[PDB]
């Protein structure tokens, strides 16, 4: 507080929130920045100068809380300041630029926070010499304090691979973080891989920014890069591999993703299909070349329950290979306990994380700081939406009025079956039937998401068009997928948690949700990203269409609000629709007669 | 309904009391300002000739397209006893009130005013520095007192008693505190001249004999008064309530010379903008307005963050919404504030969407809410989800026989205002327990 | 031929079944079920029932957002 | 530093309007606007699409043309699917063509253009036209090509021989054949094949096309024309009209053969003679009596007055915004300069100054 700040009569609910004690600079017209020192928040104008230069700086040193079109709510965090000094930045420069572009005097607590969040950059480093995690620090000053720490037990010494994660968490805790910047040009102990950036690949500007933020020194800075759906994370990884030119391993959490990224990699880089050996229960071949790649999903390394000897040979081979680069695509699942064996198993130097969503239910997402590193780059979602790099969606949330026909049983149903009982409302069937009619009238490919296989198959059978879920085999689901894509008999399909994420299905510009998870925001966000990567995200007059059929009179409204609040905070609003269009103009309605409603009620009473 | 309320009050005022009010030119000038354009034209035409007219000449002059409006004007004219329409020679012979006529004539000619426009001293000073500043001070004190945010300068005991008695900003004696009624929030929503007129209507209603016509004539000349001059301190009842409205901060009186501030002018007449707010689906407030009064009134129903020069920011919470709801403050009052605080870019976008949806379908199969329902209906859905029930308590008559008890005594009960509910087919209708004035009398027949 | 002293309430089948659950956890307050949109209740417990109904849709949603 | 750019832009603008001439300009006009409604105008590339904006701009063009020059008839033929379709005969009532264009609103633009067919039937429609009427056609075009049945050059020669001019407002860029049309029809001028750069430029171009055009000395047709002022009646009884054959309360009466009509400025249906009001003929007198430009006096020199002569406001003070009417020797503000030069058509300083 640069004032006396005598408490105002209107500042009672302003529990240290009345931010008028600051002496506002007369350059408030030009400068775009406020500071909120009560919570560390930052208030940023979208209509004053210096904001274009300050946007990347605020992303680097701060995190945004909320970014609508008019005012961006940012927040300096120690995580973001560590990311800033890891990119290469410092407290004094941050304070100087902040006072240069700030309308307001710089707060003492913020000054102290940025002073504290300055790391020993360059002091603590680790290298791998013949699959051995050598902790090579620049001084014995590091060795004294680290041996002063009880966990541990120029100059380089060994720390065990499972102990590497624990000691990385510990050194982050004592705020002595390690930078992992591989000198792949200087290191020739690893086999260099003759892969070249083909002229057929040219890079987007924000992707070039993402590379150069972690290629500022020419070394590969290890961390996270968060890019939206369809941004070209495969292209970014291909460019990083081609400019590293070493043995590289990338694991993604689907065998379909294994197939698709293997063909993407052999397409847009000069690595050879001989050098790429694909590992799965389809085939477990190995490449015998000095340099190349072996791809598998996380399952064929995590599992030890039912493993083949050829799988054992392959995992032995990858254990033997000292890789120079690792990318954990869809990094939201690898910090799970059966999945966080990556450092314990794979000897790889540079650790990059590419994913769409950097959020989850628990705090395992912050473990990537001592698993792979901080966020090296992020692309602004609404900026790419207006840039056409991702889509523009007219989301329409459908508040289906609850039928008492199903509510009478739903209220007296037990808890494990209440969910399946209120998913299956005949009014919801009626609304879905007219919505499918109306969007096939508009000529839009529609994908329907249900959390339950029986509800998915019942909706699919009432449509007369097939279903795909997690228990459907791969051959049947791809047959149904190609039937949907090319065959005009299959105009719409019925997808599930194999369709929510980790697939490339951007044709469906229309999406209707009949069910979802209880509170998993990431499933809903990935379902939105399924159509955010749509092909017609660039044409004029485009707005994608998202629909969520949710039953009234439940907790499902609060559930959907919880699942949607991340997208609302992103900028993907959820508009209110209760009275739909064309409710009786459709002649035939699914389970329209009350006898039909009681029929479906006792049909689902057979299970519930 | 300000002119409606004042006209209704003057119609409640009897004919000769009205004629007493029509005696003085300042009162006649203010009342002429109140009259609608047609009657204003009629009286300015007839005021300069002592020729009474029959109704037939006026009817022949009047174009029949606005005949309803003509009927409204002449209905006000007759019901105020400003007219003397008598069926002389079989024809409804039209006659203006003659005292009103001559006092208007003298006011227009600048003739005999008897200082009804004001017993003038004409010692003019600066008003922006003393009168406007003291006026803004006293009005700020009473305004934040009405808000409920703490302020030391309490109002007068007369207005304090009027608030205690009245249903405006209830000084609940069990709590000992002024409390925001729904009528209090109506007063908050009101325009400033509306607030002044409601205050004077309530004070005139409560005040009795203090001569009522003296208060009336003094109020009319006080509205007629001009800023920044000294004047003679007149009737003594007028003088003592003049000291009362001095304590309200309306006039800057040096205990005989008094200096009327700008509030008399606003009482007489009114005089990306300020007060324009950008709505947000994230409920964020982008106000193009700032005042400590603005923050004080926004504290009642909006969760705010900080105060900057014109940029008042915040986020509307459902806690703020239900804080408004639990005070008895109406969601219609809330949207009255909201729709009076809209912004140009968003209303242009709303009108563009309206014109887009006009060509597709007339109904559009959408709820009728012109303000963009992405943010606006979220409150309106919360508005419908706020009340969402109907409660009937007390007596109830049930199991009727046939509709002679519905189309004869319950259809008649629509004309007298005694039922709370009406259902012919259920053969029951609900009334309040205390509303049995004329319910158990003709229903027995 | 009867006229019992009750408080008529406009209702719904769903909120009426909630009223029935109110009767289940303490009975004989609500007098009789007229139709799907009408009910008759003890006039002494109308706002007790209203506040408990407020608790009922609180348990439905509660709008915490904390 | 924006005022220097505004000043040099105003200089480069005023270099074109330095020469103001009292050319003989056509009053008895004959304007045709053909419309193409093809696949090209289905592009939403300009918001909302080219078809919608040309519809709206044509509405405005009809209004402006009938307001400024009510002494002409207006015909519109649409182009669609390799056929040119007449939708609007030449008429004195703009409302007919307004309704036809409203019909064109709801229908769907599609097909390919044929300027040969379009201009041929435009020629045929322009065939029974009297000598004093100035036959001229506006053409809008969005394609870069034209499918045609036969030669265009014979049509060009015939159009030149029959004394009809054209002006092309192309959409995308220049088309060489359209340049050839404009040049050869327009005595070698290149001031008729115009390409917009945005919708505002299109608006300005339409406003430019509103104006009457000068005529050539060699194209001499100086003659008289018979004229008749009618008389309006306001009768109690409804009376049958000659034109639409229906009962009319009022209506003008024919000065010659004493019939009655329903609208003006129109020709008689019975004695077959044109009927106008003096207002209609005086409407173009600003074109007949043009206004000289007004000069800002320099800020360095001494000033006759420091506030505006006409609107009576203070002149603002770097440069001097005192636009001087040299014909009346009075300086004016920019607002008054704009209003007198565009909306008004007289100089009140020259009205006060006696001659
Ligand atoms: Mg699926
Ligand atoms: Zn006619
Ligand atoms: Zn004639
Ligand atoms: Zn001027
Ligand atoms: Zn002049």
UniProtKB/Swiss-Prot annotation, chain A:
It comes from Saccharomyces cerevisiae (strain ATCC 204508 / S288c) (Baker's yeast). It is found in: Nucleus. GO terms for molecular function: 3'-5' DNA helicase activity; ATP binding; ATP hydrolysis activity; DNA binding; DNA helicase activity; DNA translocase activity. ATP binds at residues 227-234. Keywords: ATP-binding, DNA damage, DNA repair, DNA-binding, Helicase, Hydrolase, Isomerase, Nucleotide-binding, Nucleus, Phosphoprotein, Transcription, Transcription regulation. This is General transcription and DNA repair factor IIH helicase/translocase subunit XPB/SSL2. The gene is SSL2. One of its GO terms (biological process) is transcription initiation at RNA polymerase II promoter. Residues 430-584 form the Helicase C-terminal domain. It comes from the Eukaryota. ATP-dependent DNA translocase. Component of the general transcription and DNA repair factor IIH (TFIIH) core complex. When complexed to CDK-activating kinase (CAK), involved in RNA transcription by RNA polymerase II. May have 3'-5' helicase activity alone, the TFIIH core however has no 3'-5' helicase activity. Also involved in transcription-coupled nucleotide excision repair (NER) of damaged DNA. In NER, TFIIH acts by opening DNA around the lesion to allow the excision of the damaged oligonucleotide and its replacement by a new DNA fragment. Its EC number is 5.6.2.4. The keyword DNA damage applies. Disruption phenotype: Essential, it cannot be deleted; epistasis studies suggest it is involved in damaged DNA excision repair. The chain holds residues 100 to 767 of 843 of the full protein. It catalyses: Couples ATP hydrolysis with the unwinding of duplex DNA by translocating in the 3'-5' direction; ATP + H2O = ADP + phosphate + H(+). GO terms for cellular component: cytosol; nucleotide-excision repair factor 3 complex; nucleus; transcription factor TFIIH core complex; transcription factor TFIIH holo complex; transcription preinitiation complex. Residues 214-376 form the Helicase ATP-binding domain.
Curated annotation (Swiss-Prot), chain C:
Gene3D superfamilies: TFB5-like. The keyword Transcription applies. The keyword Transcription applies. It is found in: Nucleus. Its main location: nucleus. One of its GO terms (biological process) is nucleotide-excision repair. SUPFAM superfamilies: TFB5-like. Keywords: DNA damage, DNA repair, Nucleus, Transcription, Transcription regulation. It comes from the Eukaryota. GO terms for cellular component: cytosol; nucleus; transcription factor TFIIH core complex; transcription factor TFIIH holo complex. Component of the general transcription and DNA repair factor IIH (TFIIH) core complex, which is involved in general and transcription-coupled nucleotide excision repair (NER) of damaged DNA and, when complexed to TFIIK, in RNA transcription by RNA polymerase II. In NER, TFIIH acts by opening DNA around the lesion to allow the excision of the damaged oligonucleotide and its replacement by a new DNA fragment. In transcription, TFIIH has an essential role in transcription initiation. Belongs to the TFB5 family. Component of the 7-subunit TFIIH core complex composed of XPB/SSL2, XPD/RAD3, SSL1, TFB1, TFB2, TFB4 and TFB5, which is active in NER. The core complex associates with the 3-subunit CTD-kinase module TFIIK composed of CCL1, KIN28 and TFB3 to form the 10-subunit holoenzyme (holo-TFIIH) active in transcription. An additionnal subunit, TFB6, plays a role in the dissociation of the SSL2 helicase from TFIIH after transcription initiation. Interacts with TFB2. This is General transcription and DNA repair factor IIH subunit TFB5. It comes from Saccharomyces cerevisiae (strain ATCC 204508 / S288c). The lineage of its organism: Eukaryota, Fungi, Dikarya, Ascomycota, Saccharomycotina. The gene is TFB5.
